[PDB]
Amino acid sequence: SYQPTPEDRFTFGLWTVGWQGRDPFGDATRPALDPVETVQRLAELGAHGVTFHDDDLIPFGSSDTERESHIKRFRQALDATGMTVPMATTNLFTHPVFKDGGFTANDRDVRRYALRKTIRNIDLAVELGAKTYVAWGGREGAESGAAKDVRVALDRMKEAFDLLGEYVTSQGYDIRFAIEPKPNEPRGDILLPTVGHALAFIERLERPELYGVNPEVGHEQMAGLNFPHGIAQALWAGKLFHIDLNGQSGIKYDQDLRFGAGDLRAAFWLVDLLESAGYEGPRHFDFKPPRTEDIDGVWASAAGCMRNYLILKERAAAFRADPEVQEALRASRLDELAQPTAADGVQELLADRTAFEDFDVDAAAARGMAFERLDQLAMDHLLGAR
Numbered sequence: 001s002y003q004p005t006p007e008d009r010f011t012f013g014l015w016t017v018g019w020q021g022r023d024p025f026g027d028a029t030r031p032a033l034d035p036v037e038t039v040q041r042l043a044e045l046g047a048h049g050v051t052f053h054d055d056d057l058i059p060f061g062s063s064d065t066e067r068e069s070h071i072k073r074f075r076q077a078l079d080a081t082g083m084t085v086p087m088a089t090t091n092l093f094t095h096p097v098f099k100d101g102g103f104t105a106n107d108r109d110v111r112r113y114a115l116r117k118t119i120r121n122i123d124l125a126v127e128l129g130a131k132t133y134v135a136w137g138g139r140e141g142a143e144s145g146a147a148k149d150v151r152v153a154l155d156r157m158k159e160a161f162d163l164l165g166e167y168v169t170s171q172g173y174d175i176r177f178a179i180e181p182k183p184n185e186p187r188g189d190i191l192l193p194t195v196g197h198a199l200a201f202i203e204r205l206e207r208p209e210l211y212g213v214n215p216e217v218g219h220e221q222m223a224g225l226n227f228p229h230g231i232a233q234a235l236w237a238g239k240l241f242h243i244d245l246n247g248q249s250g251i252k253y254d255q256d257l258r259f260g261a262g263d264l265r266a267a268f269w270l271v272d273l274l275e276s277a278g279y280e281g282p283r284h285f286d287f288k289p290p291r292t293e294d295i296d297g298v299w300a301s302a303a304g305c306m307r308n309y310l311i312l313k314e315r316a317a318a319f320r321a322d323p324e325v326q327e328a329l330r331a332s333r334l335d336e337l338a339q340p341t342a343a344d345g346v347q348e349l350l351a352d353r354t355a356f357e358d359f360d361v362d363a364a365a366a367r368g369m370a371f372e373r374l375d376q377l378a379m380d381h382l383l384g385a386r
């Protein structure tokens, strides 16, 4: 039971299981992993694929020959295992040159470098099969108010994404972009801090259809937001191009716990939503095995990500299939929510005395919503008490 297979579409970043455990107050607790070892270990755990930043696959500053060497060994591991690469991204955050940003660095020469670094990796991503190219603008933002003129920075951010869209259009690539929001860390405040801000920004790009979001559980929770609700808004907009699954224990530094950890009920409601919406993309884990763990704990934590998704999938399906739940949803008027409010139009609504003049507000108000019974059925299903 709960054994993942490639059919389940689980993916992991090289940098997840490969995290050496450096944190702001700590040196590495684990050795670097060879990407080939990661591909092989994740395949044996039942993953479907991996993702990478450029600099996870090819050490920064590699010569062209070294580059090609790293890419070849990786492609041979992918090919041997049947592991895929559904998504890739650029590291525009680790190198000190990016200390004020990539695309929105105040220094123009840095902005241009960021774009070139990204374009080089888009070409590689496409060859390896990525259908989504993620941008996490972790350095875009500020610690102080005058350091960054945010309207101007948004002009630069738009200019960068529009140039990338021109490039992929020119090349005839299939690949779409996904912006990964985060509210803070490592900048005091990060630009495009939530799913909403990223969705809004996309609508001002030249080719909006090429851009969506890559929301991460823990990032929205760093703003105290409801991650299932934000995913619902992304799905409503047609913009859930990819998703990052993990756990977060509240409003604090980005913990990147394994999926299921942190806010467990939010993980349940997320799975419920993804499955009823028919999301077809990768189930990607952007997580860190805690630095307390050795390599055996790395693979246990990765396995746990997948196991928890599968348990929650079972529980959510059982919840929605239960006749008792179907009845409680009706008792709570979830069916009525789906009826148009006024398909009859403005003039019919305005002439309808049952909508105002003759509406019995007190009788309506006295009708309980029955939400607590509904939620306790949900709790019982999650806990396997049904």
Ligand SMILES: [Mg+2]
Pocket (backbone or CB within 6 Å): 035, 056, 057, 058, 059, 070, 071, 074
């Ligand atoms: Mg390598």
Ligand SMILES: [Mg+2]
Pocket (backbone or CB within 6 Å): 161, 162, 163, 165, 166, 205, 206, 207, 208
């Ligand atoms: Mg554009």
Ligand SMILES: [Mn+2]
Pocket (backbone or CB within 6 Å): 216, 218, 219, 254, 255, 256, 286
């Ligand atoms: Mn995170």
Ligand SMILES: [Mn+2]
Pocket (backbone or CB within 6 Å): 180, 216, 244, 286
């Ligand atoms: Mn992420």
Ligand SMILES: [O-]
Pocket (backbone or CB within 6 Å): 216, 254, 256, 286
């Ligand atoms: O993350």
